[PDB]
Amino acid sequence: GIALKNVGRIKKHGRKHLVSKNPYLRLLVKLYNFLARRTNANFNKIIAKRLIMPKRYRPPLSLSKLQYHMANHPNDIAVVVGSITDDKRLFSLKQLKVCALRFTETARKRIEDAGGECLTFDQLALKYPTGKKCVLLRGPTKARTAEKHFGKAPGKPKSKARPYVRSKGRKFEKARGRRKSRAYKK
Amino acid sequence: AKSKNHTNHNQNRKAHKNGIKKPKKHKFMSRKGLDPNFFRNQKYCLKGIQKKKKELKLKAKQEKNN
Amino acid sequence: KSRGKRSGTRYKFSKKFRKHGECTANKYLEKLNYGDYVDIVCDSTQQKGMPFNYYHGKTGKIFHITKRGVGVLVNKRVKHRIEQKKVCVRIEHVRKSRCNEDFLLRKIKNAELIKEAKLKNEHINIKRKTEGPKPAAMIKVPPSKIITIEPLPFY
Amino acid sequence: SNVSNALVWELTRKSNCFIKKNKAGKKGVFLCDPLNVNYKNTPSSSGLVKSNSTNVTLKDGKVVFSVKVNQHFKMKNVEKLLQQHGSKNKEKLLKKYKRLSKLY
Amino acid sequence: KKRLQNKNSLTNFAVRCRLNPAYKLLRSLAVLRMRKSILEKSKNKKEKRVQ
Amino acid sequence: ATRFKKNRKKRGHVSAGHGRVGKHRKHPGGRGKAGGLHHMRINFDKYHPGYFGKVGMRHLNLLKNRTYCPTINVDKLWGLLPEEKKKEFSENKDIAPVIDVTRKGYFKVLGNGKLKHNQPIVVKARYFSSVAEKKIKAVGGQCILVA
Amino acid sequence: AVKKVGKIIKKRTKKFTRFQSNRFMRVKPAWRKPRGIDCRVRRRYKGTNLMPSIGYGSNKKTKFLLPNNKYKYVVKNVKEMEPLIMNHTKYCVQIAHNVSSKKRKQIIERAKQMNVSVINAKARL
Amino acid sequence: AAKKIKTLKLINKKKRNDLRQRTLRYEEEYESERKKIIELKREARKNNCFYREAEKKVVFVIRLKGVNKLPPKVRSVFRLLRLLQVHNGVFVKVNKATKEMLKIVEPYVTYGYPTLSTVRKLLYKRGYVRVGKVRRYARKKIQDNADISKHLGKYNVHGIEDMVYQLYTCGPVFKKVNNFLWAFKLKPPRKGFKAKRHAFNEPRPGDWGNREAHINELINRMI
RNA sequence: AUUUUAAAAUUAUUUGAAUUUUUCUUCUUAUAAUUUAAGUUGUUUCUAUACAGUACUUUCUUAACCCACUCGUCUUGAAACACGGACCAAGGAGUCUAGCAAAUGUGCAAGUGUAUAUGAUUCUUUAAACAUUUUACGCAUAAUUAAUGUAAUAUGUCCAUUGUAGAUUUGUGCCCCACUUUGCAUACAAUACCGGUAAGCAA
RNA sequence: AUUUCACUCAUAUUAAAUAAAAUAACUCCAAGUGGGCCAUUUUUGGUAAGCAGAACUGGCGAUGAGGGAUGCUCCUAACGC
RNA sequence: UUACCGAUACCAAGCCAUAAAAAGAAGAAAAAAUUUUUUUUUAGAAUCUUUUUAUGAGUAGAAAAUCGUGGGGU
């Protein structure tokens, strides 16, 4: 016998292969895997990882956010490993060059109007196999409604997690344990 | 029925499997309920600093513009 | 059955022999900052600001300072996990740590050494050389001083 | 622009109607493609995936020469055909043809 | 690289040599030492005794 | 579908995954919400803090309609116009778009977010938050109360 | 024990028969893995039936090779026969149990033309 | 490409040459040291004074007890050492902390001062090494110098001989070398142990003591 | 299908050295070969000049040496003097719906779901598929308060709050480095501001 | 005290060792479990108990193998073929 | 005091799985015959192939890969 941890075998806690059966997506992942293995430029590896990731970990990146990100360095190409959605809150859209997994139609249209460029991942690869002058961007992941229920459970002091409730209002989880006046608070 | 009402046996072992998890030790602990007055002063100072920085930035921008 | 604040504290809080009275007037002049490590040694002469039985002896960083109150971050092992506990104490129980200053002295010395090295461009080792193997030695001993030994008989 | 060889392969790596795999003796997956030189289930040999293939088949009785855009024809003659439309592989094809000839 | 045998160094002379290049010289020296006749050794004994 | 159900995967094990010593009995913890405040109080405390007790005023006949007032923030006001029209408006500082916020199905205008500077907006709505109104004015626009 | 023939190594020629399949008729020899406390087999006491385990498996390289060194391929029809024209030294034909005699004969004939071995040519002969 | 290859070859040759010289130097030193020791002893004998030989700097530690029925502290110590199997052997730089650790796991290990020849033998017949990116090691037998010249190239210790030398006497780079070496998976002794329960220092036949001068012998027996 | 190479070693040569004067003396200049490299190949039989035999393979069969206690079960513990089981065949047990959840897949995405229902050149399948009138409602986009209600920097600037670590980039001397350069996600705070509640003022 | 600048702190032996230390954190979703028992040592009640009750650790339980003739826990040692 | 016997522990070698790690989108080799025929192959399936190293107990439980039965579309 050997006094080891988990005996011999080295734990890896992450994705290994995309569970997805989307042929195009599979192809893309294959490509990026290849890129990673041949040119260890990191960037490629990261991209591959992102591609592999599940849908929650590819949150949608809003156009406004993208614009904000690009605000420092111009002409370089922002790459987003997820979907990009448009933002009615924006009035102006600069000349953006964006590579995404997905553009919502409206976002794409907006980009076009801006006199910009919409690149798919393959296109990006073709243009920049080492990912030169690229900038990886992610959407807000923990801004998801699921995440609001996680962490310390409501009941533990100073926790800011949303209880699973039916609706909202007085009649619904707003009494004992939520105000100094009904037993305790939080 | 009479039963083993208490034991701390194996507890230690259990604890040790995931290991005695040390505090994450964040650099910036929340200064909420900590010394008032002073903390408001600190906040004010910070604000002032920020303002100064902003002013500097503005000046720089102006210079750039010419 | 009985778990009060001062349970099993017959000796822990009891003042040492010929060291009763009260806390000395010079103990209050010990300067403390937001980051200093501190031992909590409960003087049960001052009942005000008395920390719990457990924290007697255990050290910790100062995170908060008030009029006469010192907040200390003390690590407590709770079954499966060690967690930080914010103990609000008084100055009478709070004593400044010594290890920190031992470290400080060493640091100071190291800086000096570094400076010296620079003066001359040299490779001087700073890391504390722990008690290693003893080097080869030739010890001069006269035959008059070498006292022979044999196991003692039973009585 | 929407369809490429790799994509095709991906689509039909599992779900073909030429793929026949031995249920008894698990090792072995064959492609019954009209444009497969060696009947292996690989995208680098399959007729569905490859843009240009010049396989020799048996079809119905008489030995038929197939070309990829799709052409059908009918040893010297075979060689000539190969020379004409063809871009080691040739040798293999020839060998296959010989074998086919043997069969009646 | 496909693993081949794992060759005993201490024996497989070539392998040993590869491992440690000076080893050959050492071996030669050893051989030379072995070579010398016993008469000389015997003679040396007297000298040793004297010393 | 049934074929990918865990029970099918546990089929040859004795207890069907529900434990050998502690069996699987019908309704162990009680039925439904059961001992909420008794044997299941801790769970309630930790996941459903303010569950027990009633707070505040009764409201015997609600009628949610009376109180219906869908909100929009100013930030999203200019978005309510098509891109080309928006561009045109931007170009022409001389003319200001009116927006019937009610016609677009909103009852209150709130003021979360910036509005493009100088560009005047005419906002028609039933309700406005002070701040939103202020924001509108700062930009040279007006709020025209509708009903 | 082990049954070397060519480079073909078989680790366990004996079938793993179900525990107690030899004791009650109702229990078939078909391996079933014993569960539940006090199994003896589960516990692996000296002297009982062995438990099939992954260690027993044949080298990835010679696995489904039969004594002939050819992977067995089942054949229902001439069309199927055809995938093995470029493989006569690596796959060997077996004609499906349900093939009528004429068809079987035809298949056999085809095989001979191809130089492909038939492992069951003698059915209905 | 050809030119590059040639250059590489030349470099390799140069390295080999350098290595040989180093080896020779080491050899010269070893004998010399021994001679000096003898001389010192003679001197001591001549004059009423005594000569104590320097503490042997390194200690070779072999496990005895199994994985089962062991205290947690002891287990931890073992882990730290890099002894995980019943006959795993490793070199440990004798220190204060190290000594303490050894003491803590005294009844479960046999240790002592390995001697040079024995060490060399160990390196040769039982010397396995870790080849790969950190935390993914792969136990590969040395055989070639280019296998160790990649990792230990920065620390001026190319070739097995250099490693051996380092092991023998705690040089500037010894710890790293030790780390690089995989835990020596040793045989059981060919003549067998006396008794694994009792100590080596026990008047009755035993093992787990600090067999400082007979450790080498033991190693030889179980090589 | 070029790390079964390169080197090591060895053999026969060739130039220069060395103190270990040595038919295994070492380095080294060059060339061929070989294996001690670079995980077993060769020779001679035999099966056998056989189509199955008494050989060879394998299934069964008893022997024999050694071992092996009735399975399931509840149990700290079952071979139990614990229970259930005479035997065999068939049947025989985490399912289905409602709502919620997280996980993941997919489409769309500040939207989304065409609900009922209509419409058709829809009518074996057609109880589906297609289509959606030439601001329906759900959930989400805003929260908060018992509540009348109130409702997120704030028009100096379409700009996008401030830190400390942080991916990617941009440069300098293609992964590490040591600086610059940008600062995703996120963690950790800090501020603003919105709803409530204090407190201070207060028409 | 915070912020921006300065000068400048060992570093390939890595601010004492040693470390199959990232197989780590963290988040989620769940399962089973919540009758335990035994051994050395410390130990309380009990005349004592294969008794009841505790402490540190290891086991058994969930575990076979070699030994202890025989044995859930003792010793050796944990098990692919 | 030796010698020996003696485990599923240890070592050396093989093979199996698991885990990880290297790494990967074009070409004739040999033998038998008698300079040309014949015999074999002449690979490139990304959860895939090649190689490397370590590891392998297990009830309650969890997961994955498979296997089979009744029917459906293909």
Ligand SMILES: O[C@H](c1cc(C(F)(F)F)nc2c(C(F)(F)F)cccc12)[C@@H]1CCCCN1
């Ligand atoms: O990666 C190449 C390759 C090319 C092309 C092609 F360009 F034709 F689409 N297709 C390949 C395919 C294909 F996509 F299935 F066709 C698979 C594997 C390799 C392919 C390989 C390279 C080695 C020789 C076989 N083609």
Ligand SMILES: [Mg+2]
């Ligand atoms: Mg006491």
Ligand SMILES: [Mg+2]
């Ligand atoms: Mg189970």
Ligand SMILES: [Mg+2]
């Ligand atoms: Mg049951």
Ligand SMILES: [Mg+2]
């Ligand atoms: Mg049991």
Ligand SMILES: [Mg+2]
């Ligand atoms: Mg039983």
Ligand SMILES: [Mg+2]
């Ligand atoms: Mg003995």
Ligand SMILES: [Mg+2]
């Ligand atoms: Mg018996």
Ligand SMILES: [Mg+2]
């Ligand atoms: Mg009982």
Ligand SMILES: [Mg+2]
């Ligand atoms: Mg009963």
Ligand SMILES: [Mg+2]
């Ligand atoms: Mg009965």
Ligand SMILES: [Mg+2]
């Ligand atoms: Mg019955």
Ligand SMILES: [Mg+2]
């Ligand atoms: Mg049945």
Ligand SMILES: [Mg+2]
């Ligand atoms: Mg979902």
Ligand SMILES: [Mg+2]
């Ligand atoms: Mg129970």
Ligand SMILES: [Mg+2]
């Ligand atoms: Mg149990």
